[PDB]
Amino acid sequence: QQACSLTTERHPSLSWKKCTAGGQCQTVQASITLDSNWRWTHQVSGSTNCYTGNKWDTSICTDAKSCAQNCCVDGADYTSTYGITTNGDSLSLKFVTKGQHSTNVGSRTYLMDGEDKYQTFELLGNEFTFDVDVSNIGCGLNGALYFVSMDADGGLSRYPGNKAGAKYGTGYCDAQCPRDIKFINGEANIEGWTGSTNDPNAGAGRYGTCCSEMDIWEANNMATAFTPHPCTIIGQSRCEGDSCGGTYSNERYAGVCDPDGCDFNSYRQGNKTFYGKGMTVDTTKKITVVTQFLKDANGDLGEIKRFYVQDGKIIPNSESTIPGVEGNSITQDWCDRQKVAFGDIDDFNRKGGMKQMGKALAGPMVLVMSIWDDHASNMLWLDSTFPVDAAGKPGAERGACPTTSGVPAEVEAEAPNSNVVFSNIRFGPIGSTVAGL
Ligand SMILES: *[C@@H]1O[C@H](CO)[C@@H](O)[C@H](O)[C@H]1NC(C)=O
Protein backbone atom coordinates (compact mmCIF):
# COMPACT_ATOMS: atom_id res chain seq x y z
CA GLN A 1 0.00 0.00 0.00
CA GLN A 2 1.08 3.56 -0.50
CA ALA A 3 0.80 6.29 2.15
CA CYS A 4 -1.38 9.39 1.86
CA SER A 5 -1.72 12.42 4.06
CA LEU A 6 -5.29 13.75 3.75
CA THR A 7 -5.05 13.11 7.51
CA THR A 8 -1.72 14.09 9.02
CA GLU A 9 -0.23 11.11 10.84
CA ARG A 10 0.80 12.01 14.40
CA HIS A 11 1.90 8.97 16.47
CA PRO A 12 0.61 9.46 20.03
CA SER A 13 3.58 9.75 22.40
CA LEU A 14 4.44 7.03 24.86
CA SER A 15 7.48 6.74 27.13
CA TRP A 16 9.03 3.48 28.28
CA LYS A 17 12.00 2.41 30.39
CA LYS A 18 15.13 0.61 29.32
CA CYS A 19 16.69 -0.95 32.37
CA THR A 20 20.16 -2.26 33.10
CA ALA A 21 21.89 -4.42 35.73
CA GLY A 22 21.00 -3.39 39.29
CA GLY A 23 17.73 -1.63 38.39
CA GLN A 24 19.05 1.52 36.72
CA CYS A 25 16.51 2.65 34.11
CA GLN A 26 16.47 5.30 31.42
CA THR A 27 13.23 6.73 30.10
CA VAL A 28 12.84 6.50 26.31
CA GLN A 29 10.50 8.95 24.65
CA ALA A 30 8.59 7.01 22.02
CA SER A 31 5.20 6.61 20.44
CA ILE A 32 2.59 4.23 19.04
CA THR A 33 1.08 3.62 15.60
CA LEU A 34 -2.24 2.13 14.51
CA ASP A 35 -2.28 -1.10 12.47
CA SER A 36 -2.98 -0.58 8.73
CA ASN A 37 -6.14 -2.73 8.78
CA TRP A 38 -7.98 -0.02 10.71
CA ARG A 39 -6.95 2.89 8.51
CA TRP A 40 -8.82 4.73 5.79
CA THR A 41 -7.82 3.00 2.54
CA HIS A 42 -8.35 5.08 -0.62
CA GLN A 43 -6.96 5.90 -4.10
CA VAL A 44 -3.79 8.02 -3.98
CA SER A 45 -5.48 10.59 -6.23
CA GLY A 46 -9.00 10.46 -4.92
CA SER A 47 -10.38 10.15 -1.50
CA THR A 48 -12.35 7.54 -3.47
CA ASN A 49 -12.16 4.50 -1.26
CA CYS A 50 -10.45 1.25 -2.26
CA TYR A 51 -12.22 -0.47 0.64
CA THR A 52 -15.50 0.34 2.38
CA GLY A 53 -17.39 -1.69 4.97
CA ASN A 54 -16.14 -5.23 4.34
CA LYS A 55 -15.72 -5.03 0.55
CA TRP A 56 -12.97 -3.90 -1.83
CA ASP A 57 -14.11 -1.62 -4.66
CA THR A 58 -13.49 -4.15 -7.44
CA SER A 59 -14.06 -1.45 -10.08
CA ILE A 60 -10.89 0.16 -8.58
CA CYS A 61 -8.96 -2.86 -7.32
CA THR A 62 -8.70 -5.18 -10.31
CA ASP A 63 -5.60 -7.08 -9.17
CA ALA A 64 -3.62 -7.52 -5.96
CA LYS A 65 -0.52 -5.74 -7.27
CA SER A 66 -2.03 -2.66 -8.94
CA CYS A 67 -4.48 -2.21 -6.01
CA ALA A 68 -1.54 -1.78 -3.55
CA GLN A 69 0.33 0.49 -5.97
CA ASN A 70 -2.72 2.70 -6.59
CA CYS A 71 -4.28 2.70 -3.08
CA CYS A 72 -2.95 4.22 0.11
CA VAL A 73 -3.61 4.04 3.81
CA ASP A 74 -3.97 7.47 5.37
CA GLY A 75 -3.38 9.04 8.79
CA ALA A 76 -5.42 8.18 11.87
CA ASP A 77 -7.58 10.34 14.13
CA TYR A 78 -6.39 8.46 17.24
CA THR A 79 -8.67 9.99 19.89
CA SER A 80 -11.91 10.80 18.08
CA THR A 81 -12.10 7.88 15.62
CA TYR A 82 -10.26 5.12 17.37
CA GLY A 83 -10.48 5.88 21.10
CA ILE A 84 -6.68 5.55 21.38
CA THR A 85 -5.13 7.91 23.95
CA THR A 86 -1.82 8.26 25.77
CA ASN A 87 -0.77 10.08 28.92
CA GLY A 88 2.98 9.89 29.65
CA ASP A 89 3.84 6.18 30.11
CA SER A 90 0.24 5.06 29.66
CA LEU A 91 -1.73 3.86 26.64
CA SER A 92 -5.53 3.56 26.75
CA LEU A 93 -7.43 1.51 24.10
CA LYS A 94 -11.22 1.85 23.98
CA PHE A 95 -13.28 -0.91 22.44
CA VAL A 96 -16.10 0.84 20.52
CA THR A 97 -15.79 4.47 19.37
CA LYS A 98 -18.80 6.06 17.69
CA GLY A 99 -18.23 9.16 15.57
CA GLN A 100 -20.47 11.43 13.46
CA HIS A 101 -20.60 9.05 10.51
CA SER A 102 -19.22 5.71 11.73
CA THR A 103 -18.42 3.38 14.59
CA ASN A 104 -14.96 1.83 15.04
CA VAL A 105 -14.50 -1.53 16.83
CA GLY A 106 -11.18 -2.45 18.43
CA SER A 107 -7.62 -1.43 17.59
CA ARG A 108 -4.15 -2.89 17.29
CA THR A 109 -1.10 -0.69 17.88
CA TYR A 110 2.71 -0.97 17.72
CA LEU A 111 5.50 0.66 19.71
CA MET A 112 7.65 2.91 17.47
CA ASP A 113 11.31 3.88 17.36
CA GLY A 114 11.20 7.14 15.41
CA GLU A 115 8.66 7.86 12.72
CA ASP A 116 9.48 5.05 10.29
CA LYS A 117 10.42 1.94 12.32
CA TYR A 118 8.97 -0.28 15.03
CA GLN A 119 10.93 -0.50 18.29
CA THR A 120 12.34 -4.01 18.30
CA PHE A 121 12.86 -6.13 21.37
CA GLU A 122 15.16 -9.07 21.75
CA LEU A 123 13.46 -11.02 24.52
CA LEU A 124 15.75 -14.02 25.01
CA GLY A 125 17.70 -13.75 28.28
CA ASN A 126 15.73 -10.62 29.17
CA GLU A 127 12.72 -9.51 31.18
CA PHE A 128 9.69 -7.53 29.96
CA THR A 129 7.52 -5.80 32.56
CA PHE A 130 4.42 -3.60 32.36
CA ASP A 131 1.45 -2.45 34.41
CA VAL A 132 -2.04 -3.16 33.23
CA ASP A 133 -5.60 -2.27 34.11
CA VAL A 134 -8.01 -4.92 32.80
CA SER A 135 -10.83 -3.99 35.23
CA ASN A 136 -12.95 -2.65 32.34
CA ILE A 137 -12.56 -5.56 29.91
CA GLY A 138 -14.75 -8.55 30.70
CA CYS A 139 -15.87 -11.86 29.20
CA GLY A 140 -15.41 -12.15 25.45
CA LEU A 141 -12.81 -9.39 25.10
CA ASN A 142 -9.04 -9.51 24.90
CA GLY A 143 -6.73 -6.67 25.89
CA ALA A 144 -3.53 -8.11 24.51
CA LEU A 145 0.13 -7.25 24.83
CA TYR A 146 2.37 -9.48 22.79
CA PHE A 147 5.33 -9.89 20.47
CA VAL A 148 5.51 -10.98 16.85
CA SER A 149 8.42 -11.40 14.44
CA MET A 150 7.25 -8.57 12.13
CA ASP A 151 9.84 -6.65 10.07
CA ALA A 152 10.98 -3.48 11.88
CA ASP A 153 10.08 -1.44 8.78
CA GLY A 154 6.77 -3.28 8.36
CA GLY A 155 7.92 -4.85 5.08
CA LEU A 156 8.91 -1.58 3.37
CA SER A 157 12.24 -2.88 2.05
CA ARG A 158 11.11 -6.46 1.28
CA TYR A 159 8.07 -5.56 -0.81
CA PRO A 160 8.18 -2.83 -3.49
CA GLY A 161 4.34 -2.50 -3.52
CA ASN A 162 4.52 -1.40 0.15
CA LYS A 163 5.46 2.28 0.44
CA ALA A 164 3.57 2.90 3.71
CA GLY A 165 5.63 0.71 6.06
CA ALA A 166 5.92 0.77 9.85
CA LYS A 167 4.87 4.46 10.04
CA TYR A 168 1.41 3.26 8.96
CA GLY A 169 1.41 -0.05 10.86
CA THR A 170 1.86 -2.43 7.89
CA GLY A 171 3.31 -5.92 8.00
CA TYR A 172 1.28 -7.60 10.70
CA CYS A 173 1.65 -11.34 11.08
CA ASP A 174 1.06 -13.81 13.86
CA ALA A 175 1.00 -17.52 14.62
CA GLN A 176 -2.65 -17.79 13.46
CA CYS A 177 -1.62 -16.88 9.91
CA PRO A 178 -4.63 -14.52 9.77
CA ARG A 179 -6.29 -14.01 6.39
CA ASP A 180 -8.22 -10.87 7.37
CA ILE A 181 -5.18 -8.64 6.83
CA LYS A 182 -5.78 -6.29 3.89
CA PHE A 183 -2.18 -5.76 2.67
CA ILE A 184 0.31 -8.63 2.79
CA ASN A 185 3.67 -8.64 0.98
CA GLY A 186 2.92 -5.21 -0.58
CA GLU A 187 -0.10 -6.59 -2.39
CA ALA A 188 -3.75 -6.10 -1.62
CA ASN A 189 -5.31 -9.32 -0.30
CA ILE A 190 -8.28 -8.87 -2.67
CA GLU A 191 -8.37 -12.30 -4.32
CA GLY A 192 -11.54 -14.18 -3.37
CA TRP A 193 -12.11 -11.60 -0.67
CA THR A 194 -15.10 -12.64 1.37
CA GLY A 195 -17.01 -10.20 3.56
CA SER A 196 -17.33 -11.48 7.13
CA THR A 197 -20.61 -13.21 8.03
CA ASN A 198 -20.75 -11.25 11.31
CA ASP A 199 -18.25 -8.35 11.14
CA PRO A 200 -19.44 -5.51 8.84
CA ASN A 201 -15.86 -4.13 8.72
CA ALA A 202 -13.83 -7.29 8.11
CA GLY A 203 -13.41 -10.02 5.48
CA ALA A 204 -10.84 -12.65 4.54
CA GLY A 205 -8.69 -13.00 1.46
CA ARG A 206 -6.76 -15.64 -0.46
CA TYR A 207 -3.58 -15.13 1.59
CA GLY A 208 -2.65 -15.18 5.27
CA THR A 209 0.33 -13.74 7.07
CA CYS A 210 2.38 -15.88 9.45
CA CYS A 211 5.18 -15.37 11.98
CA SER A 212 6.51 -16.38 15.40
CA GLU A 213 4.44 -15.01 18.23
CA MET A 214 5.14 -14.71 21.96
CA ASP A 215 1.88 -13.88 23.69
CA ILE A 216 3.00 -12.29 26.90
CA TRP A 217 -0.51 -11.17 27.79
CA GLU A 218 -3.82 -12.34 26.40
CA ALA A 219 -6.33 -11.29 28.98
CA ASN A 220 -9.49 -9.82 30.39
CA ASN A 221 -10.69 -9.42 34.00
CA MET A 222 -11.67 -13.13 34.11
CA ALA A 223 -8.67 -14.95 32.59
CA THR A 224 -5.12 -14.50 31.33
CA ALA A 225 -2.65 -16.67 29.43
CA PHE A 226 0.96 -16.45 28.39
CA THR A 227 1.75 -18.50 25.33
CA PRO A 228 4.78 -19.05 23.06
CA HIS A 229 3.88 -20.00 19.47
CA PRO A 230 6.80 -21.36 17.41
CA CYS A 231 6.89 -21.22 13.59
CA THR A 232 9.13 -23.22 11.25
CA ILE A 233 9.64 -19.96 9.34
CA ILE A 234 10.67 -17.42 12.02
CA GLY A 235 9.69 -14.03 10.45
CA GLN A 236 6.82 -12.75 8.32
CA SER A 237 5.66 -15.16 5.60
CA ARG A 238 2.62 -15.31 3.34
CA CYS A 239 0.58 -18.49 3.10
CA GLU A 240 -2.07 -19.53 0.59
CA GLY A 241 -5.70 -20.22 1.53
CA ASP A 242 -6.34 -23.30 3.65
CA SER A 243 -2.64 -24.22 3.68
CA CYS A 244 -2.31 -21.33 6.17
CA GLY A 245 -3.67 -23.32 9.12
CA GLY A 246 -4.92 -21.34 12.13
CA THR A 247 -8.68 -21.93 11.93
CA TYR A 248 -10.73 -24.67 13.59
CA SER A 249 -10.86 -27.06 10.65
CA ASN A 250 -8.98 -30.23 9.63
CA GLU A 251 -6.28 -27.95 8.22
CA ARG A 252 -5.64 -26.19 11.58
CA TYR A 253 -2.03 -27.51 11.91
CA ALA A 254 -1.09 -27.55 8.22
CA GLY A 255 0.70 -24.14 8.20
CA VAL A 256 4.20 -23.18 9.38
CA CYS A 257 3.04 -21.92 12.82
CA ASP A 258 1.68 -23.61 15.94
CA PRO A 259 -1.74 -21.87 16.29
CA ASP A 260 -2.38 -23.30 19.79
CA GLY A 261 1.01 -22.57 21.39
CA CYS A 262 2.16 -23.90 24.74
CA ASP A 263 -0.07 -21.90 27.07
CA PHE A 264 0.03 -21.16 30.78
CA ASN A 265 -3.39 -20.01 31.97
CA SER A 266 -3.48 -20.47 35.78
CA TYR A 267 -7.21 -21.32 35.74
CA ARG A 268 -6.73 -23.89 32.96
CA GLN A 269 -3.71 -25.31 34.88
CA GLY A 270 -5.90 -25.98 37.91
CA ASN A 271 -5.91 -22.84 40.07
CA LYS A 272 -9.33 -21.30 39.54
CA THR A 273 -8.97 -18.42 42.03
CA PHE A 274 -5.39 -17.27 41.40
CA TYR A 275 -6.32 -14.64 38.83
CA GLY A 276 -9.56 -12.74 38.32
CA LYS A 277 -12.04 -10.37 39.88
CA GLY A 278 -11.54 -10.44 43.61
CA MET A 279 -8.77 -13.05 43.31
CA THR A 280 -5.17 -13.10 44.55
CA VAL A 281 -4.10 -11.33 41.37
CA ASP A 282 -7.09 -9.00 41.49
CA THR A 283 -8.20 -7.74 38.09
CA THR A 284 -10.35 -5.05 39.67
CA LYS A 285 -7.13 -3.12 40.18
CA LYS A 286 -3.77 -2.33 38.55
CA ILE A 287 -1.43 -5.32 38.11
CA THR A 288 2.33 -5.40 37.48
CA VAL A 289 3.15 -8.29 35.07
CA VAL A 290 6.79 -9.49 34.88
CA THR A 291 7.87 -12.03 32.23
CA GLN A 292 11.37 -13.51 32.12
CA PHE A 293 12.89 -15.44 29.24
CA LEU A 294 15.60 -17.73 30.62
CA LYS A 295 18.30 -19.37 28.55
CA ASP A 296 19.45 -22.97 29.06
CA ALA A 297 23.09 -24.11 29.12
CA ASN A 298 23.21 -24.07 25.32
CA GLY A 299 21.87 -20.51 25.06
CA ASP A 300 18.47 -21.74 23.78
CA LEU A 301 15.17 -20.72 25.39
CA GLY A 302 14.89 -22.95 28.43
CA GLU A 303 12.16 -21.41 30.57
CA ILE A 304 9.52 -18.66 30.61
CA LYS A 305 8.73 -17.30 34.09
CA ARG A 306 5.97 -15.02 35.32
CA PHE A 307 5.70 -12.88 38.47
CA TYR A 308 3.09 -10.35 39.53
CA VAL A 309 3.25 -7.29 41.75
CA GLN A 310 0.11 -5.88 43.36
CA ASP A 311 0.04 -3.41 46.27
CA GLY A 312 3.76 -4.04 46.72
CA LYS A 313 3.45 -7.82 47.10
CA ILE A 314 5.52 -9.95 44.74
CA ILE A 315 3.31 -12.90 43.71
CA PRO A 316 5.04 -15.84 41.98
CA ASN A 317 3.11 -17.56 39.24
CA SER A 318 0.63 -20.21 40.27
CA GLU A 319 1.91 -23.76 40.07
CA SER A 320 0.08 -26.08 37.69
CA THR A 321 -1.94 -28.66 39.69
CA ILE A 322 -2.71 -30.83 36.65
CA PRO A 323 -1.35 -34.32 37.47
CA GLY A 324 1.98 -34.97 35.72
CA VAL A 325 2.28 -31.29 34.77
CA GLU A 326 4.27 -29.83 37.65
CA GLY A 327 5.79 -26.35 37.97
CA ASN A 328 4.76 -22.70 37.66
CA SER A 329 6.64 -21.88 34.44
CA ILE A 330 6.81 -22.96 30.78
CA THR A 331 9.61 -25.37 29.76
CA GLN A 332 9.81 -27.92 26.93
CA ASP A 333 9.11 -30.86 29.25
CA TRP A 334 6.20 -29.01 30.91
CA CYS A 335 4.74 -28.40 27.43
CA ASP A 336 5.18 -32.02 26.31
CA ARG A 337 3.37 -33.19 29.45
CA GLN A 338 0.64 -30.52 29.31
CA LYS A 339 -0.31 -31.53 25.77
CA VAL A 340 -0.68 -35.17 26.76
CA ALA A 341 -2.60 -34.28 29.95
CA PHE A 342 -5.03 -32.06 28.05
CA GLY A 343 -5.38 -34.46 25.08
CA ASP A 344 -4.22 -31.68 22.72
CA ILE A 345 -2.23 -32.25 19.51
CA ASP A 346 1.43 -31.45 20.32
CA ASP A 347 1.91 -29.06 17.38
CA PHE A 348 4.18 -26.98 19.67
CA ASN A 349 6.75 -29.79 19.59
CA ARG A 350 6.15 -30.50 15.87
CA LYS A 351 6.89 -26.86 14.94
CA GLY A 352 10.15 -26.85 16.98
CA GLY A 353 8.94 -26.05 20.50
CA MET A 354 10.90 -23.97 22.99
CA LYS A 355 14.08 -24.02 20.90
CA GLN A 356 12.39 -22.69 17.76
CA MET A 357 10.51 -20.08 19.81
CA GLY A 358 13.88 -19.02 21.26
CA LYS A 359 15.23 -18.46 17.71
CA ALA A 360 12.55 -15.79 17.33
CA LEU A 361 13.14 -14.44 20.87
CA ALA A 362 16.87 -14.14 20.06
CA GLY A 363 16.06 -11.75 17.18
CA PRO A 364 13.95 -8.59 16.80
CA MET A 365 10.27 -8.76 17.74
CA VAL A 366 7.66 -6.05 17.59
CA LEU A 367 5.50 -4.98 20.58
CA VAL A 368 1.81 -5.18 19.87
CA MET A 369 -0.91 -3.75 22.11
CA SER A 370 -4.52 -4.35 21.14
CA ILE A 371 -8.17 -4.56 22.16
CA TRP A 372 -10.33 -7.06 20.25
CA ASP A 373 -13.28 -9.44 20.20
CA ASP A 374 -13.24 -12.89 18.55
CA HIS A 375 -15.72 -13.52 15.74
CA ALA A 376 -14.42 -17.08 15.26
CA SER A 377 -14.54 -18.51 18.78
CA ASN A 378 -16.02 -15.77 21.01
CA MET A 379 -12.86 -15.77 23.19
CA LEU A 380 -14.03 -19.03 24.82
CA TRP A 381 -10.48 -20.43 24.37
CA LEU A 382 -9.32 -17.71 26.77
CA ASP A 383 -12.02 -17.41 29.42
CA SER A 384 -14.59 -20.22 29.14
CA THR A 385 -15.03 -23.87 28.11
CA PHE A 386 -13.35 -24.70 24.81
CA PRO A 387 -14.10 -26.38 22.60
CA VAL A 388 -17.67 -26.17 23.91
CA ASP A 389 -18.15 -29.97 23.48
CA ALA A 390 -15.26 -30.84 25.79
CA ALA A 391 -16.69 -29.62 29.16
CA GLY A 392 -15.75 -32.36 31.65
CA LYS A 393 -11.96 -32.80 31.44
CA PRO A 394 -8.56 -31.29 32.26
CA GLY A 395 -7.88 -28.40 29.90
CA ALA A 396 -11.47 -27.75 28.86
CA GLU A 397 -12.34 -24.89 31.25
CA ARG A 398 -10.02 -21.88 30.89
CA GLY A 399 -12.05 -19.33 32.87
CA ALA A 400 -15.41 -18.85 34.60
CA CYS A 401 -17.14 -17.02 31.76
CA PRO A 402 -20.29 -18.78 30.61
CA THR A 403 -20.34 -20.27 27.11
CA THR A 404 -23.01 -17.66 26.22
CA SER A 405 -20.37 -14.90 26.32
CA GLY A 406 -18.23 -13.29 23.60
CA VAL A 407 -20.60 -12.84 20.64
CA PRO A 408 -19.17 -9.66 19.04
CA ALA A 409 -22.58 -8.04 18.41
CA GLU A 410 -23.62 -8.56 22.06
CA VAL A 411 -20.38 -7.35 23.69
CA GLU A 412 -20.23 -4.34 21.35
CA ALA A 413 -23.81 -3.33 22.31
CA GLU A 414 -23.60 -4.10 26.03
CA ALA A 415 -20.03 -3.03 26.80
CA PRO A 416 -18.98 -0.54 24.06
CA ASN A 417 -16.89 1.58 26.46
CA SER A 418 -14.76 -1.37 27.57
CA ASN A 419 -11.09 -0.44 27.65
CA VAL A 420 -7.62 -1.64 28.61
CA VAL A 421 -4.80 0.51 29.92
CA PHE A 422 -1.17 -0.55 29.44
CA SER A 423 1.40 1.54 31.36
CA ASN A 424 4.93 1.77 32.75
CA ILE A 425 6.74 -0.55 30.30
CA ARG A 426 10.16 -1.59 31.63
CA PHE A 427 12.57 -3.86 29.72
CA GLY A 428 16.06 -5.09 30.50
CA PRO A 429 18.14 -8.00 31.72
CA ILE A 430 16.60 -10.50 34.15
CA GLY A 431 16.36 -8.91 37.60
CA SER A 432 16.54 -5.29 36.37
CA THR A 433 12.92 -4.18 35.99
CA VAL A 434 11.37 -4.59 39.47
CA ALA A 435 12.73 -4.39 43.04
CA GLY A 436 12.50 -7.50 45.26
CA LEU A 437 12.97 -9.61 42.17
C1 LIG B 1 -3.24 -20.94 43.77
O1 LIG B 1 -3.25 -19.55 43.92
C2 LIG B 1 -3.16 -19.18 45.28
C3 LIG B 1 -3.54 -17.73 45.38
O2 LIG B 1 -4.93 -17.61 45.10
C4 LIG B 1 -1.78 -19.51 45.83
O3 LIG B 1 -1.73 -19.23 47.22
C5 LIG B 1 -1.44 -20.98 45.58
O4 LIG B 1 -0.06 -21.17 45.84
C6 LIG B 1 -1.83 -21.42 44.15
N1 LIG B 1 -1.73 -22.86 43.94
C7 LIG B 1 -0.60 -23.37 43.44
C8 LIG B 1 -0.57 -24.85 43.24
O5 LIG B 1 0.41 -22.69 43.20
Author numbering: 1 to 437
Sentences from the paper on this structure:
Glycoside hydrolase family 7 (GH7) CBHs have been identified as the major protein secreted under cellulase-inducing conditions in several different fungi and play a key role in the degradation of plant biomass, both industrially and in nature. They act processively from the reducing end of a cellulose chain. The most significant structural feature of GH7 CBHs is the presence of a 50 Å long cellulose-binding tunnel in which up to 11 subsites for binding of glucose residues from a cellulose chain have been identified. In this study, we report the crystallization, structural determination and biochemical characterization of H. grisea var. thermoidea Cel7A (HgtCel7A).
The C-terminal linker–CBM1 part was proteolytically removed from the full-length HgtCel7A with papain and the isolated catalytic domain was crystallized, yielding crystals belonging to space group P212121 with two protein molecules, chains A and B, in the asymmetric unit. The two noncrystallographically related protein molecules in the asymmetric unit are practically identical along the β-sandwich core of the structure, but deviate at extended loops that enclose the active site, probably owing to different crystal packing. However, two residues at the C-terminus (438–439) were not visible and are not present in the final model of chain A. One loop that folds back onto the globular domain in chain A to enclose the tunnel at subsites −3/−4 (hereafter called loop B2), appears to be open in chain B and is partly disordered. On the other hand, the last two residues of the catalytic domain, Pro438 and Gly439, show clear density and are included in chain B. The N-terminal glutamine residue is cyclized to pyroglutamate (PCA1) in both chains, and all 18 cysteines form disulfide bonds. N-Glycosylation is evident at Asn271 in chain A, with density for one N-acetylglucosamine residue (NAG), but the density is not clear enough to place an NAG at the corresponding position in chain B. In chain B, the loop is open and partially disordered, with insufficient density to build residues 193–200, probably owing to interference by crystal contacts with a neighbouring protein molecule that prevents closure of the loop. Loop B3 adopts a new conformation where Tyr248 points into subsite +2 of the active site, which has not been observed previously in any GH7 structure. The structure of HgtCel7A indicates that the loops that surround and define the cellulose-binding path through the enzyme have higher flexibility and mobility relative to those of HjeCel7A. The long and remarkably mobile loop B2 is anchored by a salt bridge between Glu191 and Arg206 at the N- and C-termini of the loop.
